[PDB]
Amino acid sequence: EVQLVESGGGLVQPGGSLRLSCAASGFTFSSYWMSWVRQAPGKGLEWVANIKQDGSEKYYVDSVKGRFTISRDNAKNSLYLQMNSLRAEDTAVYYCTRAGWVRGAFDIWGQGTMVTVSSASTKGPSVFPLAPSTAALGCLVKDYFPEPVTVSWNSGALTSGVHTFPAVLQSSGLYSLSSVVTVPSSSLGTQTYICNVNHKPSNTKVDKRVEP
Amino acid sequence: NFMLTQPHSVSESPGKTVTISCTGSSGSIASNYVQWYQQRPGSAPTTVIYEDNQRPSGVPDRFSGSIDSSSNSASLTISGLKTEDEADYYCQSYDSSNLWVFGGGTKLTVLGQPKAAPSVTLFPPSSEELQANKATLVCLISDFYPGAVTVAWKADSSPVKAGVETTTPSKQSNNKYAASSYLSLTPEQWKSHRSYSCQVTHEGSTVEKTVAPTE
Amino acid sequence: TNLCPFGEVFNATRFASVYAWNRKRISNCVADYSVLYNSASFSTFKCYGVSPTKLNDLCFTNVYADSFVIRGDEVRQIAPGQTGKIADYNYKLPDDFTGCVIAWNSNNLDSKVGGNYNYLYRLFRKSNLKPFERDISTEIYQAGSTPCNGVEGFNCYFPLQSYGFQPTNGVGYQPYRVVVLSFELLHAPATVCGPKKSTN
Ligand SMILES: *[C@@H]1O[C@H](CO)[C@@H](O[C@@H]2O[C@H](CO)[C@@H](O)[C@H](O)[C@H]2NC(C)=O)[C@H](O)[C@H]1NC(C)=O
DSSP states (O other): OOEEEEEOOEEEOTTOOEEEEEEEESSOGGGSOEEEEEEOTTSOEEEEEEEOTTSSOEEEOTTTTTTEEEEEETTTTEEEEEEOSOOSTTOEEEEEEEOSSSSSOOOOBOOOEEEEEOOOOOOOOEEEEOOOOOEEEEEEEEEEOSSOOEEEETTTTBOSSEEEOOOEEOTTSOEEEEEEEEEOTTTBTTBOOEEEEEETTTTEEEEEEOOO | OOOEEOOSEEEEOSSSOEEEEEEEOSSOTTSSOEEEEEEOTTSOOEEEEBTTTBOOTTOOTTEEEEEETTTTEEEEEEOSOOGGGOEEEEEEEOOSSSOSEEOOOEEEEEOSSOOBOOEEEEEOOOHHHHHTTOEEEEEEEEEEBSSOOEEEEEESSSBOOSSEEEOOOEEOTTSOEEEEEEEEEOHHHHHHSSOEEEEEEETTEEEEEEEOOOO | OOOOOHHHHTSOSOOOBSTTOOOOEEOSEEOOOHHHHSOOOOSEEEEESSOGGGGTTOEESOEEEEEEEEEGGGGGGSSSSOOSHHHHHTOOOOTTOOEEEEEEEOTTTSOOTTOOTTOEEEOOOSSOOOTTOOOOOOOOEEOSSSOOSSSOBTTEEOSEEEOOOOTTSOTTTSEEEEEEEEEOOOSSOOOEESSOTTOO
16 A cells, blocks of 8 residues: 655745655655656646655756755655745646656655745736627626636626636736626617626625626 | 657547557657656546556556657557546656656547537727726637647737737536637737737637727 | 676676677676666666566576677667667567666767777678677678678678767767676576575
């Protein structure tokens, strides 16, 4: 039986320190190469560091060389990764993995802990109308901090063509989404079509009227 | 400078067989062992093929590893496909110069419904956003299966390098996927060019939408 | 049982040529595969027929350490099936081969300005080297019908060629030291083992 658990992850703004740690349980820990493999959200897998089974020689990607310090502890069946002077690119899910020998075989993968690096703090969004061209209209929830955000159409009455798309994480560390409702071309002119935005993490409720 | 290249998405029907390629850039595959990690959505990866062709204890016979001696590339072939096999497949290996390298990943989609091209809707910057000294183009994609597209922006039919923000496809209620693409800008650039294009590539075919500023 | 001489076949000084591929019979010792897989310093390191992990729990009759030098771009041929100028006329590995191929870059040793012509290779051989066969014949390859009987000219080619290993050559044209390990499965006493010394 073999299992690996990682902790110590979370949120920190650029330049801060952080220390990930993996709890090994299930194999002769003193017989495997321990590696840290990170995976950015929605991106691919990228190796980060690898420490030898006796702590002799360590290896890291050039991306984190000089800032990330891999370190193990055979007696305590643990592996660590001191992440000093963090950057935004380092935002990813870090996993501790077992090797056995150098060439390949990243045998087992723990569930991994998330590491978020963003300076931005809680902020309410700015709502903008979409103004249709059947045609569709909507609202633009721009530059809001912590996800979630809730959008209601016509104060909760309209539910027909609503399609609230997921939000991007703009380069500015601020999220942004948009919800659009497909309505009959003969409806534009009489129906009001107001969107309701509720960002509970900042309790900033904004309603916006959409017109042709 | 030894990278591993891999296709974006491959789709096949339930009973058929599909092959995933992994080519080596400056360097040389077959000079070192090759691994294939299966990663179901939201889960940690599991090893399906290690040492170019060996399946670990428990991996079905359906998974087979091959290391082409001609085109410098290894290929994973899941024969007699199963719906549970829909996942992200990454190929990894080692090189003396560059250390443990991974592939770009491939989204193997086990077709459960007929392939469907996406519906793209583009919105120009709102009159109110421009009054605020900021502009943003909204490109909302929807109703497409398999689950993967490529978004490209053209400034008056010319490349648009930076300022693009694009979501990762998510599942809709009807099993089809959808994602959005936002193009950041400034008021001067908006009315300067004749029109801005939004190109969405999906299983070969590419759909496009364009908007003109003046009104 | 003692410890095998891998610090001599690998951490060596002079290497043979591909056509005159060296060999060292290893027996009467319990090996140490740690320095070999934990190495991570080689370029080509693959095993055909056994996992390097499950080797210390294995014992063998004899181990053959064939060592030679070829230009890196040709290491692809030191493997089963793989053919070319090296696997056909210099060193061919059988299809049912059961061993390991270990190679590493060595132009900092085997590359002298102007060309270190100490290493050679075979150009012509009417017979493709049978698995593990050796063709060290210096006989002038009779290209045409008129025999050679001596110095070369047309229809007469010195079967061997040289390697112009310069420290500025291409990453593929540089010299690489190879080590091909063979494993013997005989129903006779086994004098080679891994850290499985509990059985003697
Ligand atoms: C054979 O060569 C290897 C490769 O240099 C030697 O391994 C090195 O040993 C030293 C200790 O003296 C370590 O500091 C190095 O890190 C080792 N190198 C690697 C790549 O791990 C090995 O010691 C040599 N064998 C003998 C008997 O001298």
